[PDB]
Amino acid sequence: AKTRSSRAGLQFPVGRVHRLLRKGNYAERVGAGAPVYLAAVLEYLTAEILELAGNAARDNKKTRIIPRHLQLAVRNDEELNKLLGRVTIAQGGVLPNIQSVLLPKK
């Protein structure tokens, strides 16, 4: 007895995702290949962000990922930024950016 996750060689819970597609009322029938593709996309996406957030945490000499590191990860990456263009990350703050004309002298 192998989990459907391992049959597809995934960490993300295929069984679980299959279940939530049914309980979520998305269509009359859910195909057996739909939660497999979905569990994959979900895993790809979270690896993408965790890779980036990890780097931010290293660039700050920290060992633990905090919400600030997710914020930096998402906002410094053109595509995550857009995917989450309308999302607020609690306790992420903002990117350092000061407009040119606000700086002193010339």
Binding site: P67, R86, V87, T88, Q91, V94, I98
Partner: protein, 87 residues
């Protein structure tokens, strides 16, 4: 229950330095005298819209307690989705 204090003019609890601090995070260098009243004005519209929807979910569920979920869904409705509170 005996007596419950009257809530009035709490918008002024959003102080001048607090507003200035938010301006700073938003990259602002100089602030006109009248920003503070405008900003309070704007904050109140924002909160009224989110609280109205959140309170609506609360009543719908038949609860006296506004939950984090009530707020998170209110936010989602208005396209201001918030991560990190169960939602």
């Amino acid at each position: 229950k005996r007596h419950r204090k009257v809530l009035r003019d709490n918008i002024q609890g959003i102080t001048k330095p607090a507003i200035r601090r938010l301006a700073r995070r938003g990259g602002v260098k100089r602030i006109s005298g009248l920003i503070y009243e405008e900003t309070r004005g704007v904050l109140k519209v924002f909160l009224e819209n989110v609280i109205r929807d959140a309170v609506t979910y609360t009543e719908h569920a038949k609860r006296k307690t506004v939950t984090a979920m009530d707020v998170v869904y209110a936010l989602k409705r208005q396209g201001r989705t918030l991560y990190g509170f169960g939602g």
